[PDB]
Amino acid sequence: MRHVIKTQLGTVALLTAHENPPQDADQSTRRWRNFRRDKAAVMVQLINEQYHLCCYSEIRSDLRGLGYHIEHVENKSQHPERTFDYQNLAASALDSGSSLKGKNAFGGHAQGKQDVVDMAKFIHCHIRDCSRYFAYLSDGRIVPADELNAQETENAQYTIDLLNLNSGFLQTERRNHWEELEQLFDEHIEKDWDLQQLLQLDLVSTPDHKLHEFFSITRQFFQQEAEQVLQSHA
Amino acid sequence: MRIDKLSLLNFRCFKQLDITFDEHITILVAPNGAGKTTVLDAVRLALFPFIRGFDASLYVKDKSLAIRTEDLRLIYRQEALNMEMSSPAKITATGEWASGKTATWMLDKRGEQPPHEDKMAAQLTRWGEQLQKRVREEHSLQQVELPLMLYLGTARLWYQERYQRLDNSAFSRLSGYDDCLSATSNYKQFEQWYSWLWLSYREHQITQLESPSAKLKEGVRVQRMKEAIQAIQQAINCLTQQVTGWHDLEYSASHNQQLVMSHPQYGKIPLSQLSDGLRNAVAMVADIAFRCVKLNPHLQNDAALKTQGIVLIDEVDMFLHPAWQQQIIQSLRSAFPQIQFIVTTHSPQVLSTVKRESIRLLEQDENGNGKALMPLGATYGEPSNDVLQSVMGVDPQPAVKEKADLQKLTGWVDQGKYDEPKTQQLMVALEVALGEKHPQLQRLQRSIARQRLLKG
Amino acid sequence: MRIDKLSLLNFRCFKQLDITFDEHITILVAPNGAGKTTVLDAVRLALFPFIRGFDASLYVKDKSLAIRTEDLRLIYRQEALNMEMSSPAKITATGEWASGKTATWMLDKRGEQPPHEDKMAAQLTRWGEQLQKRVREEHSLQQVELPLMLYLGTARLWYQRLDNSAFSRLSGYDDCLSATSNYKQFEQWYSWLWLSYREHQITQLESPEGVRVQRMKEAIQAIQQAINCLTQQVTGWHDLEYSASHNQQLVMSHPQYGKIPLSQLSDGLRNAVAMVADIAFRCVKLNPHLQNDAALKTQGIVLIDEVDMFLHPAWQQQIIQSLRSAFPQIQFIVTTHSPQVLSTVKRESIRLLEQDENGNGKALMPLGATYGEPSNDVLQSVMGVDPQPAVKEKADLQKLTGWVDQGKYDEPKTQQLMVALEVALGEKHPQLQRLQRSIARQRLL
Amino acid sequence: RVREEHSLQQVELPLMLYLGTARLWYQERYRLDNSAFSRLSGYDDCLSATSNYKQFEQWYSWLWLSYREHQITQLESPSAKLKEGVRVQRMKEAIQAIQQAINCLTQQVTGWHDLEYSASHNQQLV
Numbered sequence A: 001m002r003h004v005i006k007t008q009l010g011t012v013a014l015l016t017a018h019e020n021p022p023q024d025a026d027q028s029t030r031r032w033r034n035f036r037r038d039k040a041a042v043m044v045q046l047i048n049e050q051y052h053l054c055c056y057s058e059i060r061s062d063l064r065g066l067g068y069h070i071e072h073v074e075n076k077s078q079h080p081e082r083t084f085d086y087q088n089l090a091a092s093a094l095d096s097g098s099s100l101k102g103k104n105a106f107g108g109h110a111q112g113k114q115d116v117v118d119m120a121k122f123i124h125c126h127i128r129d130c131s132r133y134f135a136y137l138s139d140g141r142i143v144p145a146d147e148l149n150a151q152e153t154e155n156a157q158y159t160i161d162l163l164n165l166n167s168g169f170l171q172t173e174r175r176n177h178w179e180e181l182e183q184l185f186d187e188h189i190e191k192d193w194d195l196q197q198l199l200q201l202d203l204v205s206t207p208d209h210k211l212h213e214f215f216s217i218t219r220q221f222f223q224q225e226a227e228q229v230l231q232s233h234a
Numbered sequence B: 001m002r003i004d005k006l007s008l009l010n011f012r013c014f015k016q017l018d019i020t021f022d023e024h025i026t027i028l029v030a031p032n033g034a035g036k037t038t039v040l041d042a043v044r045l046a047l048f049p050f051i052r053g054f055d056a057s058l059y060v061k062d063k064s065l066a067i068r069t070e071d072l073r074l075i076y077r078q079e080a081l082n083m084e085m086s087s088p089a090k091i092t093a094t095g096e097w098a099s100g101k102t103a104t105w106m107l108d109k110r111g112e113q114p115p116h117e118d119k120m121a122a123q124l125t126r127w128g129e130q131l132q133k134r135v136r137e138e139h140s141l142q143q144v145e146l147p148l149m150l151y152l153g154t155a156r157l158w159y160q161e162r163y164q165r166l167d168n169s170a171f172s173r174l175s176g177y178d179d180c181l182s183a184t185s186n187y188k189q190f191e192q193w194y195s196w197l198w199l200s201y202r203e204h205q206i207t208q209l210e211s212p213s214a215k216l217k218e219g220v221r222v223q224r225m226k227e228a229i230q231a232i233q234q235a236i237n238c239l240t241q242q243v244t245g246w247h248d249l250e251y252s253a254s255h256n257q258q259l260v261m262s263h264p265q266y267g268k269i270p271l272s273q274l275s276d277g278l279r280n281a282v283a284m285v286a287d288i289a290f291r292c293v294k295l296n297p298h299l300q301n302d303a304a305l306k307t308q309g310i311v312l313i314d315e316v317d318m319f320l321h322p323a324w325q326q327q328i329i330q331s332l333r334s335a336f337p338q339i340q341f342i343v344t345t346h347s348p349q350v351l352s353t354v355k356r357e358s359i360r361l362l363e364q365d366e367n368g369n370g371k372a373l374m375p376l377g378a379t380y381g382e383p384s385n386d387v388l389q390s391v392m393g394v395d396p397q398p399a400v401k402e403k404a405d406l407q408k409l410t411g412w413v414d415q416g417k418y419d420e421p422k423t424q425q426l427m428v429a430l431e432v433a434l435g436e437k438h439p440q441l442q443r444l445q446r447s448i449a450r451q452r453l454l455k456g
Numbered sequence C: 001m002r003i004d005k006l007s008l009l010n011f012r013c014f015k016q017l018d019i020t021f022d023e024h025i026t027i028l029v030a031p032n033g034a035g036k037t038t039v040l041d042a043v044r045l046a047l048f049p050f051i052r053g054f055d056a057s058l059y060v061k062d063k064s065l066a067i068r069t070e071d072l073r074l075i076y077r078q079e080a081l082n083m084e085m086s087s088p089a090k091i092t093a094t095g096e097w098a099s100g101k102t103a104t105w106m107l108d109k110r111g112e113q114p115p116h117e118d119k120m121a122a123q124l125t126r127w128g129e130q131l132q133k134r135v136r137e138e139h140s141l142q143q144v145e146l147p148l149m150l151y152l153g154t155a156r157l158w159y160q161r162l163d164n165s166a167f168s169r170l171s172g173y174d175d176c177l178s179a180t181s182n183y184k185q186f187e188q189w190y191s192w193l194w195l196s197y198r199e200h201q202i203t204q205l206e207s208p209e210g211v212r213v214q215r216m217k218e219a220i221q222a223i224q225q226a227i228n229c230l231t232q233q234v235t236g237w238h239d240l241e242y243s244a245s246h247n248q249q250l251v252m253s254h255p256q257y258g259k260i261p262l263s264q265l266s267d268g269l270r271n272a273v274a275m276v277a278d279i280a281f282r283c284v285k286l287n288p289h290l291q292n293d294a295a296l297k298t299q300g301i302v303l304i305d306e307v308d309m310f311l312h313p314a315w316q317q318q319i320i321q322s323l324r325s326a327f328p329q330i331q332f333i334v335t336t337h338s339p340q341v342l343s344t345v346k347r348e349s350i351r352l353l354e355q356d357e358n359g360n361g362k363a364l365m366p367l368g369a370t371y372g373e374p375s376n377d378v379l380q381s382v383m384g385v386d387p388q389p390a391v392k393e394k395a396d397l398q399k400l401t402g403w404v405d406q407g408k409y410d411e412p413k414t415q416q417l418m419v420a421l422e423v424a425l426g427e428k429h430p431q432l433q434r435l436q437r438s439i440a441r442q443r444l445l
Numbered sequence D: 001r002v003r004e005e006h007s008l009q010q011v012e013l014p015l016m017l018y019l020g021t022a023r024l025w026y027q028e029r030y031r032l033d034n035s036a037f038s039r040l041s042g043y044d045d046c047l048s049a050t051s052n053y054k055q056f057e058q059w060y061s062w063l064w065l066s067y068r069e070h071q072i073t074q075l076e077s078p079s080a081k082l083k084e085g086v087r088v089q090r091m092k093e094a095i096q097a098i099q100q101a102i103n104c105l106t107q108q109v110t111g112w113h114d115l116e117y118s119a120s121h122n123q124q125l126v
């Protein structure tokens, strides 16, 4: 995953709605349903702060025509007092509203994430050291990192299974990205190109707050060159 | 005629379901259960009120063409002794009958009571009756064109061996609806009609040759026979010729009164001696072709190219090999470019040749609720393994004994620990077990080389 | 009973062919019209002399079990535009009948004359008759082993006593060369067997027997083990039973889910279960003296056409190993065109059928490897089919990729082709997006 | 109301029965369909001039055979009696309710009691 840094308080409507927090599932559901009018601005801010990447899978939903939806990191049915807390909201792919929620859904629409979540073992994008919990393989899988305790590995596996991050669609997309990365590596080796001018297209954002999808795979693929590029321009 | 949407309620497998259909081609995919057959059966039941208006009804006592008490949903609960039914069972359909005529009709059944239908279902019978009336008043200058309804099930090749005219008459025209939604083979009807057609063509040709004084009257009979034969043969060629090489299905008396086909290098051989896939495909295409020819005789050559209707096919790619599976859908669309096709399959080769908007994936939850969704990723022109894993959720790597070791080796190598003796021993063991040319091992070697290069 | 080699001469589509068969499993692979059913029919004809030695088939006058006039080869004479018949047709087979009994027998038909067998083909009938005679022995204390002969064609879906007597024993050869297997009849006879066993089991609880009870128990155990060899690894299902409590249905057990009805599954899996169960039941009937190891210790030959009918690609990968594990002493000869099946066998067990312009056939091992191989690789190598379909714009996409690769993106024709492909395929096509990213990458330099 | 899934309110059904002279069991007078497992099968021929003994015999035999199946299974493999024992409890309670009803009339005067299905006696009620 990628760590998301929040630097915006929110919107006036969202702040006002949070003045009297809901205190049970029914109130939270009803008020979330009634809040449909001012969801657009909140979603716009959420998408801008994430550089148009899904909070869990790091895909460009806009480029694929799949959309986004507002996701509560901690389920509002578990702790409804945070239904309107801006710090508990993220943007996930597969907008709510024929390819939609189902058995194979991932991210916020995954089967496990809808039922129950154990916050003790849950690793999400709002934890400063989430990126060191995961590794991306050549066959399209995502696995826990080797340099993890016997306790951190269980948390990483639980998080991977909860969000269904190893579905066929995600595995195929990540495999194709790895293949393209190999192609680019060979190309720059052959052409005597520089491996920093090109990487600025993928690792540095744009004035319209956009990042190439699968940031973590690209960063892990180029071990030290990616770190040099990031440090130079961030 | 066209159907845009279908919604089920307390039917065989589904507590409820909503499914929309593409305008030209739709493919239903289901890993578990018999959802696809249920959807096809529901569609077939929803089309029967139209056929009922042509005198084509349960006169042969076809009990499968109505909702039965065996079509309702039964819930077995382990902790209770009794078992009840879910009622009512409903089928609702939306579509188009004629140009600009949109309608919605429903059929339902309550318990053991006889099935009942609403007023639009009765208007669907009235439309068939008035089409029949227009067909029977042949003393007219205007032309009326009839649609096509057809059902092709898995039992279309089971007992092929058990069992005429062509003109602008009601009796000849309405024979195209005979057993059109039946679940049994229809091959002998075609064989007998085609034999009559060829024999009449030849006999009238010789009769014209020996006395052409009847030109202006009998030379058009022969022209009509020739045009029908040409339309049927062209439709069949569109499917068989490019892939297999066989073409020009005919009737030959010198071959023991049999249907024969021709090949550039193998000559004429009877159809009954050809392969399973060829016979299946020929039967499938011929069904539609002669039904189109018999329904609309006034479209001489373009009977198949200008006919409208709905065709349902279950397991469209039966007995076909992967190279043939990559061309069946486009062949069907080219042979009959005005018909709406609804088919079922479980072959990635077929799925790689259509766009993701023409695919429906069926699933159920524990309580019977159904969903018909689109694939999340593109499928048009993609490799077969991509479609297999992304859509059907099957890993192209088979689960052989060495798979787990391969996964462990991949996880170790891609994370930088490849110089350890344990990793090298596993690498050599897997090279001897699977060979050094395995694609995964090759890309792992590439990864090791890349990681070595970076550290410099 | 084992067949090692087969030779054909002027048979349906082969001018001549010689094919060698693997000891445990052989898979014939080819496109349509290649001659897979041709070889299976030849093998089935080579085995009929043995089945003709039993009274259960001594009355079988079926014309499909002998060389017909339609089996002779026809040659197309293009200059004369005529079909010429070539005679005679021959089938020669080599193999072992019993331990240490090698033989070679032949069958031939000449023109329109009746088919004729050679001297050694009658000895096979004599051996069958001797086996039948030995089966009808009362006080014999030396066991008699009967081999399993079975043919399951593409029409295997169209459509007891269980004693230790000669009639029940030889009832295992009932319609064996034209066998049928659909789940309705399987459910019928399995339910009958389970009902009888339940009756005899309850009678013991009420009032705390012999041959019949033990035979029923052994048959049930053997069939359950055989089906477990099929279903217990892909899923957790095991121990198919009949349950009156569960609304009089057949059910399976899952450690985490409990019981589930067999009638809620797809037709393909139900038919596969029916096929495995039918083979197991025939094995049990043929050799009563093996008790619950009849399926694991019976020898014979089973022929299957289109082994992967109506099977999901997930089950096509776990079908050959299931058969090898359930019946480890039987020789299987199957046909298929699916690469998922081929991705799980060694290359020694595969035969590829081809021909030449003159009709000379060949059956050779694949040159490359196929065990533990991805399906796309097997499709490209064994079958010669490109995994990427040839859609209308494939050539245009390849040309555009080539042009962009060499660095000609700035020419007007490249941009025109790009716009045409954008309007045709769309703006979110992955290949077009890759090309655009490549074009942007080879800038800023 | 009986045919509703996921209902909170219970439904109580009244009994309705006519026992005329057509019920009599004279000398030598004497598989389950899916509708025979419904609550509403209790109104099957309930007011007709007929004998209804075979219905009861068939359903009672089904009860006893299912109960014996559960007994055999719990004797053989004591590993699946969880949510499967509830069904056994229901079958046992049904059997004992019917048996006590019949005992209320025969035992005191005749001495006969405890009607049940027996596989030893050629699969008969005894």
Ligand SMILES: Nc1ncnc2c1ncn2[C@@H]1O[C@H](COP(=O)(O)OP(=O)(O)OP(=O)(O)O)[C@@H](O)[C@H]1O
Residues within 6 Å of the ligand: B266, B269, B273, B274, B275, B276, B277, C011, C012, C013, C030, C031, C032, C033, C034, C035, C036, C037, C038, C039, C070, C071, C072, C073, C074, C305, C335
């Ligand atoms: N007597 C004959 N002379 C010449 N060619 C023949 C003769 N009989 C059949 N053929 C040809 O042989 C081929 C039939 O082969 P076959 O049915 O075994 O093919 P297949 O596709 O491998 O089989 P299947 O699909 O049934 O598994 C067809 O080309 C048919 O034309």
